[PDB]
Subunit: 153 residues, 2 copies
């Protein structure tokens, strides 16, 4: 039962800790924690390809997509491996995250350890938009905070 | 080939970027970069077991030691996989790092991606310090900065 963890930081008020846990090699991954400092509403939430924070969140590259698919929401059969949808922040700027995902893994070719989790300025449109960008990034806007996903006990 | 990268951050002025490169599965890893804000002299340099920085460098756990050995220098036969010896800072407080190591790896069983790189307050005694602590940690003292090791382009 592997566990992983991510400490999310950036240049504004967004701060957070996100935990990952996967009981079996082909079980769902439970993703949970809290992000504070976010505007009330939806914020796109994705695993990005590189665990490179050398220029902040920009160096993480694009959404993690080892199967070369189009962007979607987490419950779409067409999506990037890293497409975890939107987190929702309350009026006190806190997003309490509690997700179960079928596509990300802590092993194999969907393995996300060593890559970057990113929280965005605006809502992810889940790939349902009337432009090609929607099918690439979900139009979620700037990267507000991020962290490298590491092995936890 | 694989690349990885680590951005070292702490509570004081120590900071830097360390690059990893591995040409072949289970071939040697080149480790290079620059660390500033270090007092002149030797500072222990290890991969710790967990990529957990939620409580900062404290949460990273002990030396990465999957083969259950005792602590040594990097050129010793008896060492932890994480044992990278010492880096040396100059009089301008800068440590230029260039290491090649054959025991750490960016894939397979000695994989350090998702783990934590740590640079320490003083010299690692290379497990020859003559007490039990030496055989555990090399007596290198507190952790000045660390970063989670992430996959790079
Ligand atoms: Cu994203
Ligand atoms: Cu150490
Ligand atoms: Zn996507
Ligand atoms: Zn050691």
């Amino acid at each position: 039962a592997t566990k992983a963890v991510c400490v999310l930081k950036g240049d504004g008020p967004v701060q957070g800790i996100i935990n990952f846990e996967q009981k079996e090699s082909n079980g769902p991954v439970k993703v949970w924690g809290s992000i504070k400092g976010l505007t009330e509403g939806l914020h796109g939430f994705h695993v990005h390809e590189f665990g490179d924070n050398t220029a902040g969140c920009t160096s993480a590259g694009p959404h993690f997509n080892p199967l070369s698919r189009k962007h979607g929401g987490p419950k779409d059969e067409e999506r990037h491996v890293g497409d975890l949808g939107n987190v929702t922040a309350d009026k006190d700027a806190v997003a309490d995250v509690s997700i179960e995902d079928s596509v990300i893994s802590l092993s194999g070719d969907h393995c996300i350890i060593g890559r970057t989790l990113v929280v965005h300025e605006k809502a992810d449109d889940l790939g349902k938009g009337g432009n090609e960008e929607s099918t690439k990034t979900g139009n979620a806007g700037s990267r507000l905070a991020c962290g490298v996903i590491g092995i936890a006990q």
